[PDB]
């Protein structure tokens, strides 16, 4: 019954703009700044592009054409729109290269994302048919639920004392009746197990008496109870009797849609030298030197801890442009908060020399001149 | 030792101008290092959101906690404004009334923080003493 | 303390000690700032004479509007330079 004009808008490109997702979650009790805000952990608005011809006119498929002062001249045309029409009759926009190019930088490292491992390194891919699964069935047993990553219930350890009370009085309290039915289904199957077995050599599931007594038998073994309660509220397992239980489930996909590579078990064949041992190094910056009990380094837009090891010790104003060292990214993963934590590992000497050779800035060429 | 010491002072000087605490995963663009951004133009180190509602505690029922009453009064003994606390008008009125109850009951000073809290803070050995004079 | 009890008086709260990284000259700065954030000078001026409830209430309404207007004006002067930066 939709009108033809209303049927075109449903599939229009503008109507496809995703809603502004909540910002990257941070500690609920901090002193965040209000007037000034730095770049976020992950993007929140959709980045836009246009044709080189339509950009010279300021046409971005928006309400009105954007100004040419800050929208033309750059190589990569990227822009974010906070409001298509604000109270000032202007499209409140801003450059989107902060996050747009950071994705391109990270995708130039050629590194997959793997599930974190407690401290024999085992980098298991995130995109697998055994772990990456959201759909389920009620009949499924508790064990497979650990594999999942998208739980409907909240994380108890993460919730604040106020949020916890609200959850109890608005999600758990008005569920006793339904929970009683859930037990009946379990008790029903229990009666069928003995019958089926003896028959080799289900009931209507309506017994309000066994249920009450069934819960009094589990008061001495709280473990099996929580195991059952976690299935009715879809809570992330917390006790070892494990995966991502230290910081809780990932609010997003374990890869967070930043890289879709499954493994890095490849050897880039170099033209002259041949198949190299490790991956090409990457130059990074130095932020917050040791002399804060750790050093921060900027590896392709992201901030990660320095390798476990001058340069990191003290700051040096004389160095122009700042201290820049080469380094190899070993492992990358997404924490519960959504940040992209990189296991930056010190690079080798030959790798840097080989990689600089193509750039043409290598002081001494390994090819030919090198006698030994 | 003279050059090293001097260099350290100059190094720390710049470290004081980097008004930013880089964390793990925080994305930074070439603009985040500009002076306009490092200046920290924001003049407010304000609270995030209504600490009282998060901890879910009735202030009126915690009038005993002396450290809790000394946190919402200035060193002079004046209740802090909603700007500083960053609370809602209701939670502010509850904490404001919780500071007046304790001071009114006579179990907390009204012009400074509790004495037992002044002993654990800086200047413990310099606190103004009372000579017996007799 | 154990042998001498702390002198608990209004000046005890308005006290600032000298430390290695805070000399006498620096303590005065911290004092003047803390004495100005608590509006000690203003109170002395308002306590010199009596202001009946009506006048006090009406004086607050005038002062409170000039603060909201000023705060609402500073936000407009910075919203202008925000839109100007975008090129509008």
């Amino acid at each position: 019954g939709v009108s033809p004009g209303g049927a075109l808008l449903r599939t229009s490109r503008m109507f496809s703009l995703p809603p502004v997702i909540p910002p990257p979650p941070g500690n609920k009790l901090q002193m965040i700044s209000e007037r000034a805000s730095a770049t976020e952990a992950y993007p929140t608005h959709q980045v836009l592009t246009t044709f080189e011809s339509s950009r010279s006119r300021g046409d971005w498929g928006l309400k009105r054409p954007l100004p040419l002062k800050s929208t033309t001249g750059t190589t990569y045309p990227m822009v974010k729109v906070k409001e298509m029409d604000s109270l000032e009759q202007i499209t409140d926009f801003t450059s989107g290269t902060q996050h747009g190019l950071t994705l391109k930088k990270f995708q130039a490292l050629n590194i997959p994302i793997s599930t974190p491992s407690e401290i024999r390194p085992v980098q298991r891919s995130v995109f697998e048919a055994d772990t990456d699964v959201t759909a389920f069935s009620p009949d499924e047993q508790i064990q497979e639920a650990e594999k999942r990553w998208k739980f409907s219930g909240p994380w108890l350890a993460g919730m604040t004392p106020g949020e916890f009370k609200e959850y109890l009085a608005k999600t758990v309290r008005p569920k006793r009746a339904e929970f009683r039915k859930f037990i009946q289904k379990k008790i029903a199957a229990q009666k069928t197990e003995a019958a089926n077995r003896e028959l080799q050599e289900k009931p209507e599931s309506i017994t309000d008496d066994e249920v009450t007594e069934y819960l009094r038998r589990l008061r001495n073994d709280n473990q099996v109870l929580y195991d059952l309660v976690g299935q009715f509220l879809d809570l992330a397992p917390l006790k070892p009797p494990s995966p991502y239980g230290g910081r809780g489930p990932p609010i997003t996909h374990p890869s967070a849609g930043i890289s879709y590579l499954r493994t890095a078990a490849y050897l880039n064949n170099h033209p002259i030298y041949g198949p190299q041992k490790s991956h090409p190094p990457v130059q990074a910056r130095v932020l917050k030197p040791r002399r804060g009990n750790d050093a921060k380094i900027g590896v392709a837009g992201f901030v990660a801890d320095g390798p476990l090891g001058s340069v990191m010790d003290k700051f040096d104003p004389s160095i122009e442009g700042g201290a820049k060292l080469w380094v190899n990214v070993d492992k990358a993963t997404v924490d519960s908060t959504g940040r992209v934590q990189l296991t930056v590992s010190d690079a080798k000497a030959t790798d840097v020399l080989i990689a600089k050779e193509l750039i043409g800035d290598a002081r001494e060429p390994i090819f030919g001149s090198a006698p030994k | 030792v003279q050059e090293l010491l001097q260099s350290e002072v100059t190094s720390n000087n710049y470290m004081r101008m980097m008004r930013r605490r880089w964390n793990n995963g925080d994305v930074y663009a070439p603009r985040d290092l500009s002076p306009y951004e490092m200046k920290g133009r924001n003049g407010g180190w304000v609270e995030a959101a209504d600490v009282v509602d998060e901890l879910g505690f009735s202030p009126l029922d915690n009038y005993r906690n002396f450290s809790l009453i000394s946190d919402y009064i200035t060193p002079f003994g004046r209740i802090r404004h909603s700007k500083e606390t960053g609370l809602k008008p209701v939670n502010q009125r509850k904490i404001a009334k919780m500071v007046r109850r304790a001071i009114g009951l006579g179990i907390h000073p009204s012009v400074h923080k509790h004495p037992e809290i002044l002993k654990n803070s800086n200047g413990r050995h310099l606190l103004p003493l009372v000579v017996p004079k007799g | 303390q154990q042998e001498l009890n702390i002198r608990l008086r209004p000046s005890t709260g308005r006290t600032f000690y000298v430390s290695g990284h805070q000399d006498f000259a620096g303590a005065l700065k911290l004092l003047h700032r803390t004495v100005a954030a608590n509006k000690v000078k203003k109170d002395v001026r308002l306590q010199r004479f009596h202001e009946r409830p009506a006048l006090k209430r009406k004086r607050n309404l005038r002062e409170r509007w000039r603060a909201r207007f000023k705060e609402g004006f500073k936000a407009a002067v910075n919203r202008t330079f925000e839109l100007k930066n975008q090129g509008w």
Binding site: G322 | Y14, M17, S34, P35 | -
Partner: peptide, 29 residues
């Protein structure tokens, strides 16, 4: 490369303001 150009600009500003405070500290005494 772009970070270098931006970082160097920050060094200049830092050096100036640092010297400013030093000169501003001579007046306290």
């Amino acid at each position: 490369e772009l970070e270098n150009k931006t970082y160097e600009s920050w060094k200049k500003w830092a050096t100036t303001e640092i010297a400013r405070q030093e000169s501003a500290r001579a007046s306290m005494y």
